[PDB]
Design a protein around this ligand. Structure first.
Ligand SMILES: Nc1nc2c(ncn2[C@@H]2O[C@H](COP(=O)(O)OP(=O)(O)O)[C@@H](O)[C@H]2O)c(=O)[nH]1
Ligand SMILES: Nc1nc2c(ncn2[C@@H]2O[C@H](COP(=O)(O)OP(=O)(O)O)[C@@H](O)[C@H]2O)c(=O)[nH]1
Ligand SMILES: [Mg+2]
Ligand SMILES: [Mg+2]
Lengths: 178, 173
């Protein structure tokens, strides 16, 4: 068993809990930690990955220490809410301040991709933020299950790139391509 | 890129043909809409531009073009035909995906341009052809799926496109 501690942060209402629950619902199977922690094991590039998913950003002990426990952070905004996109920047700064020495894997997540007509953040703008500030970008929908699978496979791959040798990840990339 | 593949699709054609009404269906219902859809089992993020005014730069921005006329208006059919050539001329080093779109197919008693004529001209023009009704939603889904396939044919390896055609043939049959 290899653990991947993944933390959801972002403005209230962007879909963190809905993403978490969709992830938990799709995959079969740390209950003592409480109702905001989800554990599921995935197969990624022919190797098991046990994701511990932490969703306690909203205003008990784990909540006050959210920035310190993760191997990887999902900074979520809603594509329909400019304010949440700005909040994601506040969070990026707060997080890289708390973990100054570490190349912490971050995914910027533009959630609610199904709400096409209410879009306030262009995919180009989300992409540009990720490029300039050095993280990965993906648009998702918990409502429609767009890229939910891809998000969690992606975060595993990103953590593995930081942890493991160029050889190991070389075989895994060759596994993924073929 | 990571979990995202982008397709810039531009709607062009005469005023009143139904460019915006098609864009509205795409949106779910303002210059631009952005939606990810699945085609042949693979997600495709379409950036749909609906800002054509009746120039040269608009001919350069797109990965692909939807040239729309109304089946009730012969003048719009001729302009669409003109735009097709202009676009080919504007992008000389490239084979740009184009669909010629005969919109308003619900208005049977008002039609001026026949289905055969549209098909025939499209063969002559070497482009794809489809008739749509934006009012009643017919072939609109097929239109946006079709433009994605078109871009993939130019962009991706011939093995990848072989897999997609097989996937597609199984779904339809
Ligand atoms: N349309 C749509 N609604 C969503 C999506 N994700 C979450 N929601 C809705 O957004 C609201 C807030 O979601 P929630 O998970 O509680 O947000 P949180 O505060 O970040 O944990 C709820 O009504 C959800 O049903 C999505 O991808 N699309
Ligand atoms: N009957 C019918 N009317 C349509 C169709 N598409 C558009 N229209 C109508 O044609 C008018 C012009 O459409 P619009 O989208 O504004 O054309 P545009 O100038 O090319 O963007 C509107 O009043 C629509 O209701 C269609 O498929 N069938
Ligand atoms: Mg929540
Ligand atoms: Mg219009």
């Amino acid at each position: 068993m290899t653990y991947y501690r993944v933390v959801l942060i972002g403005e209230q209402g962007v879909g963190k809990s809905t993403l978490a629950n969709i992830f938990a619902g799709v995959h079969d199977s740390c209950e003592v930690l409480g109702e905001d922690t989800y554990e599921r094991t995935l197969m990624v590039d022919g190797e098991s990955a046990t994701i511990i998913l932490l969703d306690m950003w909203e205003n008990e002990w784990l909540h006050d220490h959210c920035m310190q426990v993760g191997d990887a952070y999902l900074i979520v905004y809603s594509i329909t809410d400019r304010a949440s996109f700005e909040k994601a920047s506040e969070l990026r700064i707060q997080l890289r301040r708390a973990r100054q020495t570490e190349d912490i894997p971050i995914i910027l997540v533009g959630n609610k991709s199904d709400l096409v007509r209410c879009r306030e953040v262009s995919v180009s703008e989300g992409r540009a933020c990720a490029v300039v500030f050095d993280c990965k970008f993906i648009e998702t929908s918990a409502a429609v299950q767009h890229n939910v699978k891809e998000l969690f496979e992606g975060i595993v791959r990103q953590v593995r790139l930081r942890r493991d040798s160029k050889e190991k990840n070389e075989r895994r990339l060759a596994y993924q391509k073929r």
